């Protein structure tokens, strides 16, 4: 059961840092070598350099040479990456992953691919501060349709829900989108029979954590 | 300075079929250090194949990896529902670390034209400060689509963003959202608000669109 | 005669590892 | 200190060259 | 260590056609250090290609190398007479200097029946110990010939050696010779000595043989 | 151009040992690596060694290495191989051979290979004893067909020629068959118009010099 398990998502202003762990399980820690990896939005998956648990020794990717720093602690069997000086492009899923088995037949470093793969750890980098979604109605006009806008909030994310999670068929959530402002936006839509909307109540529920922000927003025809 | 292209961009394939994914290396790997890797969303991407042809623990012989030189292939014998996600090749070792760009295996179903949707701006939102105009296109196959947004007769470009839904587990399909942006100011100032959707499903495209002011 | 050598697909050459 | 390496196919691994072997 | 193993073992050939060279090595080898020798009897081997597919200085287009991992070739486009020769491929440097078997390129030419004789031993031999029996066999295409003989219609077996010259460079012919060897009381105690030839260019074996003492 | 003169033939007892010479020309003799390698009867080439004639260095083939010597002589452009404790099996064609140029980017031995080859030496190792040749005729009956068996020599070669070189056509010399006793043996043929027996005279001329045997047979029928 060969397992990484990785600290949880970060938001981080321009010019700090972050760290991240990596706590292996089901094998030999000091054994196998562990590799950082990221994936920023569209982009393609970036190496960033490999740190060996027994000696501490380590390489790093041209690009990362001097603003990262890798470390590791055998006693908790944990792997650890810090990132300094952060910039917006730094926005990404951070990877760690062990290398493959080793055989002595084998030439070295043939087993350096990334054998077993932690979750990610998301890093955000942006001078935006933590705030609320406006939640605005998308009102309903055979099948209709009909949602809630979600905008204007920071960081992601928030989940929505529909009639408590009693409506769920016919209900498409999409991903948010950046704006140039900084925040986040997106919307949830709903395919209903035209036949019900003077009967079914739709109501989307709509959380957002990290500002303790909650809102219930029934939806309906506007009495045009 | 190793650079790995893989191609197709997407393959669309139903359960059953034979997927071939090909990455295509600047640099001749005589090494054979060579993986390809597997990711959905949300998960942690997974290992498939190392050393060019060596299956990794507990993947299906169902995988197989091939090629040598500039050219190397990753192949599906026979597709499963459970293979539907994104594939990447990688050069490994001796310092050099690239991935490929990704080809994704979705899946081919029926042309599913799109029921199109558009929404005005809300008095709430108006009343806040600003507009957004959404165009909803929903349930639709394949994933190419095109909206365009026209205010006034007047061709909207670089001013709305789109988003997209992952392929639905359940009927194959996608849906997508386009959301025009403009200053309260300007919403005002215009009458007409359409959005056109062109679709392999479409005989012709279709346009949906309302009259700021009533309904 | 400290570190390992292996080959280099970019360089075409066997090369030293790295990491101390 | 650090030398010219060569790869052996007989032995499948990189190998050292010092005018002799 | 590494083998090499080469084929076809011979490549009849006719000036103008294309050759192709096989060689198949034992382990794969990513160094492409791999090389072609031309050798024709009675002179310096000469090198073709080295490198896998670099032709050595003074080498014609018409020849060239490829392959790559454990299958490698030699082609040369059109054959020209000077062409026809032994060719025999190598791995080298890092402690690997081993050559395949080779093959022969031999110039292809009509069927050619073998003109065979039969001579006896002479008194002058006989009066020594030992009787010299021997056939030829003539101007004949292809190599490929049996020679069977028989003392007293008993078939020899063990008690023969035979010789066979280089392809002939201007009519391509071969030539054969066979000696029995039998003391001189063995000699004296038979009567018919016959060499039967069986070739291509013989739809039924050819016997020749002669009866000692009386003619 | 590059040139590679190899020493004469040889032959040898079992046990004892033979040098070949290897002298160069046309190229800088100390800038090239020298390899050796041999050729048996119905055997595949085989490497011996090379030596580096700038510094002596060199590498053997587990093969060879108890037995064999390389060294060269810068002076004269000159390498030699010495092979000790002869058997049998080292009967053979033994070639010296260049390695090729190199360029500064290229990996270590990348032009190890046989760049440019001498043209051989014959080395022959046998128990057997110098020993001239009998020459018996192969009578003709009636083309027709005549010849000369030259029979139990050593060592090789013989030279044989028809009336002195001028009759050529029809002529066959076959490759010399080793015998259990350690002697060769060969045939020499030629076909002949039949009517031409007993008025045209037919002398197949022999000569083997490690033995000074020169002889000159009239083939005649009986
Ligand atoms: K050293």
Same mark, same amino acid.
């Not at chain 2, 498939?48 to 042809?53: A, E, P």
């Not at chain 2, 993947?59 to 169902?62: A, V, Y």
């Given at each position: 059961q060969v397992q990484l398990v990785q600290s949880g998502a970060e938001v981080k202003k321009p010019g700090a840092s972050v760290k991240v762990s990596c706590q292996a399980s089901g094998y030999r820690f000091s054994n196998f070598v562990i590799h950082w990896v990221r994936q920023a939005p569209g982009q393609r998956f970036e190496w960033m350099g490999w740190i060996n648990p027994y000696n501490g020794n380590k390489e790093f990717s041209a690009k990362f040479q001097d603003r990262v720093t890798f470390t590791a602690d055998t006693s908790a069997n944990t792997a650890y990456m810090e990132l300094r000086s952060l910039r917006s492009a730094d926005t990404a899923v951070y990877y760690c992953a062990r290398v493959g088995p080793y055989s002595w037949d084998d030439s070295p470093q043939d087993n350096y691919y990334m054998d077993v793969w932690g979750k990610g750890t998301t890093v955000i980098v942006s001078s935006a501060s933590t705030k609320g979604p406006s939640v605005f109605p998308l009102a309903p006009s055979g099948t209709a349709a009909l949602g809630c806008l979600v905008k204007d909030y920071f960081p992601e994310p928030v989940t929505v829900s529909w009639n408590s999670g009693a409506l769920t068929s016919g209900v498409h959530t999409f991903p948010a989108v950046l704006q140039s402002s900084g925040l986040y936006s997106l919307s949830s839509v709903v395919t209903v029979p035209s036949s019900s909307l003077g009967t079914q109540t739709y109501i989307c529920n709509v959380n957002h954590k990290p500002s303790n922000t909650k809102v219930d927003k029934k939806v309906e025809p506007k009495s045009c | 300075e190793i650079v790995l292209t893989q191609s197709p961009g997407t393959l669309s394939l139903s359960p059953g079929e034979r997927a071939t994914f090909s990455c295509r290396s600047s640099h001749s790997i005589r090494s054979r250090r060579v993986a390809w890797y597997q990711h959905k969303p949300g998960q942690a991407p997974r290992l498939? =194949?190392?050393?060019?042809?060596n299956r990794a623990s507990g =993947?299906?012989?169902?995988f197989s990896g091939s090629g040598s030189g500039t050219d190397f292939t990753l192949t599906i014998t026979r597709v499963e529902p459970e293979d539907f996600a994104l594939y990447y090749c990688q050069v490994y070792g001796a310092s050099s670390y690239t991935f490929g760009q990704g080809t994704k295996l979705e899946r081919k179903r029926t042309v599913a034209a799109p029921s199109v949707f558009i929404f005005p701006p809300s008095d709430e939102q108006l009343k806040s400060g600003t507009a957004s105009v959404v165009c909803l296109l929903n349930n639709f196959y394949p994933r190419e689509a095109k909206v365009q947004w026209k205010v006034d007769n007047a061709l909207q470009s670089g001013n709305s963003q789109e988003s997209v839904t992952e392929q639905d587990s359940k009927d194959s399909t996608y849906s997508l959202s386009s959301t025009l942006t403009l200053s309260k100011a300007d919403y005002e100032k215009h009458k007409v608000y359409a959005c056109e959707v062109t679709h392999q499903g479409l005989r012709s495209p279709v346009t949906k669109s309302f009259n700021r002011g009533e309904c | 005669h400290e570190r390992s050598y292996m080959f280099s697909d970019l360089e075409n050459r066997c090369i030293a590892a790295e990491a101390k």
């Open positions: - | 498939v =194949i190392h050393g060019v042809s =993947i299906s012989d169902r | -």
